[PDB]
């Protein structure tokens, strides 16, 4: 069984990574319950992409 050796790439260029770190973090959250976590738990709350 021979490994495929294409005469040409079917896709001209690799697809760009459209889900990057700036896409990972949407924005921080500022609700009242959140503030408790930064003070007492040393934890940050974030809204992130659903696919991350």
């Amino acid at each position: 069984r021979l490994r495929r050796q294409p005469k040409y790439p079917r896709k001209s260029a690799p697809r760009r990574n459209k889900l990057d770190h700036y896409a990972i973090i949407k924005f921080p959250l500022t609700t009242e319950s959140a503030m408790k976590k930064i003070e007492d738990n040393n934890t940050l709350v974030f809204i992130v992409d659903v696919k991350a």
């Binding site: 009242e32 503030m35 003070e39």
Partner: protein, 370 residues
């Protein structure tokens, strides 16, 4: 009784150890009684007797106004283009603190020093890191206030360097003076708005080859001052068609007047810096320790008077604007973000605090400068 040094440092009370402070401009109330003049109360009848019953209250306004006069003369002495307003505000505040010899809430600054540039109108002071250099082609509204035992005096003027603005300055000054003389006892606020609009609109401004018409900022208006309460709940308008409420004996008023070469209305443009605890709200629960701590700090140090973020950083408090907006949502403190007109417009303001004495009308904030 000593004298004041060239850089003002002697407290006002030291200049008048006797206890009596220089009186403002005494003016007879307008002859709005259908021609009959009000020059019947100046005689020392029971009117003057009950005027004397509140003499000690007036003296506080007199010393506060004198301190304001010296502070603004000092500011006029050294103000020049090219220096940022962070150090300008620091100099104004420290000079006012030394002249008023603040001690807790018995004496101190009534509200943060507002220095609005160009289209901005009021309630702007630089925050930490605000790098704004002044320019030759700038106009600035220096609004600051001092108080003695809560007797607040509010005064404001406009500084210019390019001589192309003198027409607008004189228009706004004439409007403010007309509002001053029009005010009186038992007169409707709509009348003072009528007078201000009818004096101020009859001026034309020629700036940079473009002819503009100066118009009042219908959004802003004057206000009444109370004991530790800058806004007593009565607003004197500067445009036609207002309320029909009267002004009564024993009240004090800040007759503000704004003029713009723009649209005559303002909105919130940049970051808020002025804040004010509500005089009417009572006890509202808080759930954040930081928020509670900031609340008690501000009510101990600023009470019901207005404050700015510079005054909180000056106290060593950091990481606080969070709990500050938390108090804002809880309704304890109301933010007062800067009010600005259309970009490229210019605004001028002149303000004076007036006293409704039983026998006469004293404009305590009057000075030789304006």
């Amino acid at each position: 009784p000593k004298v004041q040094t060239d850089p003002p440092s002697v407290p006002i009370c030291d200049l008048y150890p006797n206890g009596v402070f220089p009186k403002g401009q005494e003016c007879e109330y307008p002859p709005t009684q259908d021609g009959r003049t009000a020059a019947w109360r100046t005689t020392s009848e029971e009117k003057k007797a009950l005027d004397q019953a509140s003499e000690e209250i007036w003296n506080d306004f007199r010393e506060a106004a004198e301190a304001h006069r010296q502070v603004r003369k000092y500011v006029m002495s050294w103000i020049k283009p090219g220096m940022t307003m962070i150090e300008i505000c620091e100099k104004l505040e420290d000079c006012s603190r030394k002249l008023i010899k603040e001690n807790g809430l018995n004496a101190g600054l009534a509200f943060p020093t507002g220095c609005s540039l160009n289209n901005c109108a009021a309630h702007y002071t630089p925050n930490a890191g605000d790098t704004t250099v002044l320019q030759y082609d700038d106009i600035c509204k220096i609004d600051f206030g001092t108080h003695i035992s809560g007797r607040i005096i509010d005064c404001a003027f406009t500084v210019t360097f390019n001589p192309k603005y003198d027409t607008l300055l004189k228009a706004v000054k004439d409007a403010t003076n007309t509002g001053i003389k029009c005010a009186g006892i038992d007169v409707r606020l709509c009348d003072v708005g009528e007078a201000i609009q009818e004096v101020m609109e009859s001026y034309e401004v020629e700036i940079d080859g473009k002819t503009y018409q100066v118009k009042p900022i219908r959004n802003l208006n004057g206000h009444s001052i109370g004991q530790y309460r800058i806004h007593a709940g009565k607003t004197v308008p500067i445009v036609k068609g207002g309320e029909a409420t009267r002004m009564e004996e024993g009240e004090v008023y800040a007759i503000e007047t704004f003029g713009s070469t723009g649209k005559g209305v303002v909105h919130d443009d940049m970051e808020c810096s002025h804040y004010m605890k509500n005089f009417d709200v009572g006890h509202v629960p808080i759930r954040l320790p930081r928020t509670k701590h900031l609340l008690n700090v501000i009510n101990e140090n600023f009470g019901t008077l207005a404050f700015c973020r510079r005054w909180l950083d000056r106290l060593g408090e950091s990481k606080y604007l969070m709990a500050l907006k938390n108090l804002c949502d809880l309704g304890i403190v109301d933010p007062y973000p800067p009010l600005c007109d259309i970009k490229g417009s210019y605004t001028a303001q002149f303000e004076h605090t007036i006293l409704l004495r039983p026998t006469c009308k004293e404009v305590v904030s009057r000075g030789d400068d304006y």
